[PDB]
Design a protein around this nucleic acid. Sequence first.
RNA 1: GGCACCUCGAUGUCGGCUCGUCGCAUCCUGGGGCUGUAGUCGGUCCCAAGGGUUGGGCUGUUCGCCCAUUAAAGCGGCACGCGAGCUGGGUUCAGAACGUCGUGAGACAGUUCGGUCCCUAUCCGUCGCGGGCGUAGGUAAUUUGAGAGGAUCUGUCCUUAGUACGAGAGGACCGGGAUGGACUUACCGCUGGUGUACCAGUUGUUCCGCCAGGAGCACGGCUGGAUAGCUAUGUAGGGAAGGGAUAAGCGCUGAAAGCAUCUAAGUGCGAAGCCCACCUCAAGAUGAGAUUACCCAUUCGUAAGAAUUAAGAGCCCAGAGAGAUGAUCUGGUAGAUAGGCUGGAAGUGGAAGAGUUGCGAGACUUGGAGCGGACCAGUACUAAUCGCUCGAGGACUUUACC
RNA 2: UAGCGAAAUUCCUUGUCGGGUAAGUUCCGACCCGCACGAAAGGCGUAAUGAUUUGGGCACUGUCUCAACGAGAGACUCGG
RNA 3: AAGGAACUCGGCAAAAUAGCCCCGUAACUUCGGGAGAAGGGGUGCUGGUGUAAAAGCCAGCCGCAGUGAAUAGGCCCAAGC
Lengths: 53, 125, 114, 205, 121
Amino acid sequence: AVPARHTSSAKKNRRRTHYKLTAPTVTFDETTGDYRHSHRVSLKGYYKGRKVR
Amino acid sequence: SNRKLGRTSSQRKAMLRDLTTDLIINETIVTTEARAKEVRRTVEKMITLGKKGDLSARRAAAAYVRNEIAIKDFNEETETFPTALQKLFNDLAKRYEGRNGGYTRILKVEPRRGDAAPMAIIELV
Amino acid sequence: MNLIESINAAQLRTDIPDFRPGDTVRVHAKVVEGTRERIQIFEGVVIARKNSGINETYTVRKISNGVGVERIFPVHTPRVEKIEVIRHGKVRRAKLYYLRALTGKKARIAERRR
Amino acid sequence: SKGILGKKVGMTQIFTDNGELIPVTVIEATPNTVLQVKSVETDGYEATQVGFDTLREVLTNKPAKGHAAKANTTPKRFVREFKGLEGAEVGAEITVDTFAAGDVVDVTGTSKGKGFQGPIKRHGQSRGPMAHGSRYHRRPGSMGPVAANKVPKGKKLAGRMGNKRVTVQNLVIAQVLPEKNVILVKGNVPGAKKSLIVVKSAIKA
Amino acid sequence: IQTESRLKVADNSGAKELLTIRVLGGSSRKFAGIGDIVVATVKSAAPGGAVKKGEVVKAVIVRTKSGAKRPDGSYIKFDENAAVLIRDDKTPRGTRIFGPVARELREGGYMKIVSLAPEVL
RNA sequence: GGCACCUCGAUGUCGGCUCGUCGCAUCCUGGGGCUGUAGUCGGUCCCAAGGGUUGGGCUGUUCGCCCAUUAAAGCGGCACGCGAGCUGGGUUCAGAACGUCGUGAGACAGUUCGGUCCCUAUCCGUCGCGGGCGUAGGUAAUUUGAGAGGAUCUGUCCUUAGUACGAGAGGACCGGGAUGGACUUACCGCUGGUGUACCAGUUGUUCCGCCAGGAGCACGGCUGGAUAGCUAUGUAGGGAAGGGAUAAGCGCUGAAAGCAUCUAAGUGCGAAGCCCACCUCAAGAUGAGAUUACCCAUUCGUAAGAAUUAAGAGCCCAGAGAGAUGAUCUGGUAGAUAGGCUGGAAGUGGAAGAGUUGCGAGACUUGGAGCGGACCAGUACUAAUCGCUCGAGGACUUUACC
RNA sequence: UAGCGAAAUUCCUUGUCGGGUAAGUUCCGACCCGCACGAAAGGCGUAAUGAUUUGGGCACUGUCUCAACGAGAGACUCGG
RNA sequence: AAGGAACUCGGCAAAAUAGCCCCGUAACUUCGGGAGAAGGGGUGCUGGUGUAAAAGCCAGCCGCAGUGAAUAGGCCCAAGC
């Protein structure tokens, strides 16, 4: 429960190694933008090439 | 599957029992993906019961629907839209009887800025 | 389970007559202790049948020595050959575990025949 | 010597002979698809890395159609081994009707994946007492004697469980009533839903 | 079954009560279904019969909730729970072993109890 | 017992529950000798720790006693095994009481009732699943097996044969078979149990303007069930027979010592011991294996590298045989991968309406009716579209022959 | 002295016997050897009364044989 | 399930019973009590007829279940204080 000794900060970051965030795949400039994700909706209503608000 | 919804089955049946009538009094609806998945199972088969216009079987659907006032108006005037019953089971479904099931389409809306909630739009056609 | 219904549909016997939930049934069994193939007739008020497939079928509750007894066996078992309805008993529900008490009028009365 | 390339469709019960209601089961009995022999010289063992389950175009790979390279034709999905062989052709061989290891079959499956469990749930120790004002129930027990500043290993304590292949011995069915596509086996044949049940026999027999 | 349970009578014994102690299983059974020799003792008895206050005796189990599945696969016979007293061996105590019984005792050494049993099932 | 050397800025000290492990001075199972052993049953020791070594009553408490047992009802060690796992019947608060002692204040392990057991895992260690690299190319399948684990038990009956033995009584050895008992693996078609979106009945209550038919709430209002899946008590399984080295023991021939002598060479036999053999984990087995196939050998001064990209692999999505999540598997329309649709089971039990009878309550016809979740077959009706990222061009040295 | 006595009192010791109990140091009844009972520090009785303390029995029973199932909350996956 | 307290120092907790009516009710007693002793029965609806002041009747209809759920005593024996 209660820790014994001090974490050395290098080992603390060695705990913090796998903790990182993962980039989501973003569809890039479509006309000149704007963006969606694949399997997701654009800001212009577009999923599967048709506007749905 | 037929899942737990994060709510007591009282409120699964009940929250379901609200959102179905909401999703027919409005046309297409954006709410979250899990309740969208129970739409995907449930509201398909029970508006498929909506295809048959039995007064007895739609009376069994009278549990599934509830008393409403339309905003697809003018229900209050001469007849354009019904109540929750007895005409929209053709005003919708006459388009929908040649089709062999499969009346919603589900589209993954951009997730919500509240608590990172990915929510969706379901449509009926 | 269509290959299940193929294989388990095969080799079964058809001749088992229809019957609604339980009643007193003439049973025609062949078991023998003397290894001489002796007819063992059995009787007693069936509770009902078990459901769910060709295997899972009825019991027989014979109480007729002051002890309730049961006999669960499949219909298509060739060791039994013949079973007969003595009273066409029709009651409300399927599997009368309410049959566990008040012996008299449940015993003489389950018929509701037409 | 046992081309038992196939899955089940489930678990049943049938009377077979002189009645005798037996928990009964089956294997799909798909035609065997055995590759070449691959003798002891190039690789010290004997067995066959037999192919099985007949893919469509999508599930393949240029080492899979490229396994129809060094095979002749028809890439497949699953590959096991069988030591004890007869050998007919490089890629695909003879079907169910031959049986050449034994009818107490020692059947091999890959068990049902029930997940991570409780401590008792398959490790089978005594669940703790409930009543009488004690907190302790559903927790397996102490494990470290005091004289070492250690704990030992070996004692099963927890574990994500179920995907563990088992080779149970002497499953009891006789010379099988065949088909183009059945194999009668008995009852609690291991494995899972959509699991291949390939089996060598008579290793304790 | 479980031991240390009071059971009713099915034989000319006069012992109104019969609670066994432990059936062997070598030393390691916690079941007495059918076909097996158990170790009774009595707490209540008739004005007749042998003797009443806690007497270690031997017995044969007769009625259970259900014993073993038959090699038929047809299923097991009676509902409630009873047994009879052993007459020092596989002999029965008296003539009227009253109430029914099943055939699955005769395969032990019990066929004389079966002979003094009116009907089998 | 003694010893005061750590522990007074904390070594929580009974017994029990759970969970075990080792030791052998071996309790049973194994072999063998001796016997004041005719056997049967015994005594006795030698080798043996592979496995197993009961359940209750009483005793807070060890010890011990009783019952009934089996193969036997082992002895110990381990912080009298284990309280950051647990209980708190035991001293070990304060109360109160007795007895006894003390004028008293109180006391006396003398008794008894009641009496105040926290910790949100940091490391190491455990259990299970992952990422990053490596295994002189990138891959993708296959396995060997260096090694590591698991598991080992035991009745009962018959035959051999009431023979041998033995006046008899009694009762074999060896060896065949059959059959339990646990323990443990698998799995839920069976006995079932359970089932929170399945069907029935049904109390009370509000509401669907009326009723009917329904809804909500009353633990899931209660109850009869029960599809799936899960689960034992449900179902099946094992510990077989081997090999080899043997311990103990028993051998031949033999030698000082012409004899003798299982020993000194030299040769045998010989056990649940050991090891292999039965099962599982297994090349991060850096020695990183061995095999099967594919891509190949690119563009840029490429010295350095850099950037393509093959073969792929992946993101992303769908779902579950899988699952905390990752990861696994199934798939991504060249489609049954999930949901719907259709058909059927599926359990329920004769829907509703309508009509008939009946003062009504109700009965009956339509009508195995009607309904129906995780159950199978088909069905593209939706969703797996579109897209994007990572990802080899393979170094030396020697011989063979490159 | 009366009267009670293995006492909430006897470690004397599982006192003895009998009953409950197959199994019975605890329980009851007698015995009474009273270390060390005991009379207004009341003693012996005493129905009803007790969140009493025990001992036995009936009833019901997942406490336990030997567990298993589902519902909710954390846990745990992510966002704050 | 089946079995019951075999668990434990200890049926500890949970279980189960309870409403209303109507029967019936030991022991001792300080004669009130005990005692709701215990144990038993009934309990839904339909039409009558009688119930409105008023239960009971009759028949039927039903029921797994009739204080249909909720809410509401486990009892007994004995001893000590």
